[PDB]
Design a protein around this ligand. Structure first.
Ligand SMILES: *[C@@H](/C=C\C/C=C\CCCCC)CC(=O)CCCCC(=O)O
Length: 254
């Protein structure tokens, strides 16, 4: 159909920009995770941690802070590629990014996780879930919620071409707080949803209602972010000497 043909073109466009914006794709993440030249060093305790280089919790926490900032930067680049996005009111572009980056980060982070750990430093390392959970309070509780989501989300078996359209849908949510013009945004998201639906139908013909199942996952993301910000309030009070990146603080004033 000429219609479904316009949707495929959009899917292809989004997939292309996705690959150009995110250096560590799920395809590569899985290749590293499921096993010669791509094998990561494994951090499961203190000595391995110290060897990986070749206050512990705080060192890991800021490292993870730095990457988030980087990720925010990659997501922002990707956003501009979404047709119509740059033509929207500037204030809304900022609002959409403010509320969307973390939901996207956790979505893409699932790509670098399995039930036992996380790929780090661009796949060169793998930090054990057990280790991350042994960290001093309240740091020991920072990643568990993300792993729980990933195990379930990863069960959907989505590939990069699917995720590309899905994160585009996440960014263009007309229900974000403070949006000036909701109409232009919904018209775009509507078009993206149409593209995602077709993509899922064609790429996963035997996966019944994957589309609805993926959309319901948007519920789980919102929870983990809300849960995350609460943990940051604790850190600010117990670690008055620990520094927090400005860009991240500007996004959390919600
Ligand atoms: C961050 C933990 C690890 C980051 C993933 C890989 C590390 C690769 C760098 C080499 C060391 C977990 C989070 O993403 C927490 C939420 C983001 C932080 C925030 O925005 O507050």
């Amino acid at each position: 159909n000429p219609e479904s043909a316009d949707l495929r073109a959009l899917a292809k466009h989004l997939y292309d920009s996705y690959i150009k914006s995110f250096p560590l794709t799920k395809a590569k993440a899985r290749a590293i995770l499921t096993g010669t030249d791509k094998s990561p060093f494994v951090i499961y305790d203190m000595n391995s941690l110290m060897m990986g280089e070749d206050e512990v919790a705080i060192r890991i926490f800021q490292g993870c802070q730095f990457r988030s900032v980087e990720a925010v930067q990659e997501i922002t680049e990707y956003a501009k590629s979404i047709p119509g996005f740059v033509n929207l009111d500037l204030n809304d572009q900022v609002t959409l990014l403010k509320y969307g980056v973390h939901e996207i980060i956790y979505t893409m982070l699932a790509s670098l996780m399995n039930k036992d750990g996380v790929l780090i430093s661009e796949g060169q390392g793998f930090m054990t879930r057990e280790f991350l959970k042994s960290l001093r309070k309240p740091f020991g509780d920072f990643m568990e919620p993300k792993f729980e989501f990933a195990v379930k989300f990863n069960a959907l078996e989505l590939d990069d071409s699917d995720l590309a359209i899905f994160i585009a849908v996440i960014i263009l949510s007309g229900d974000r707080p403070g949006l000036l013009n909701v109409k232009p945004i919904e018209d775009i998201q509507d078009n993206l949803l149409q593209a995602l639906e077709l993509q899922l139908k064609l790429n996963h013909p035997e996966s019944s209602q994957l589309f609805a199942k993926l959309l319901q996952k948007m519920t789980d993301l919102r929870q983990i972010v809300t849960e995350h910000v609460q943990l940051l309030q604790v850190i600010k009070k117990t670690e008055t000497d620990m520094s927090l990146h400005p860009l991240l603080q500007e996004i959390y004033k919600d």
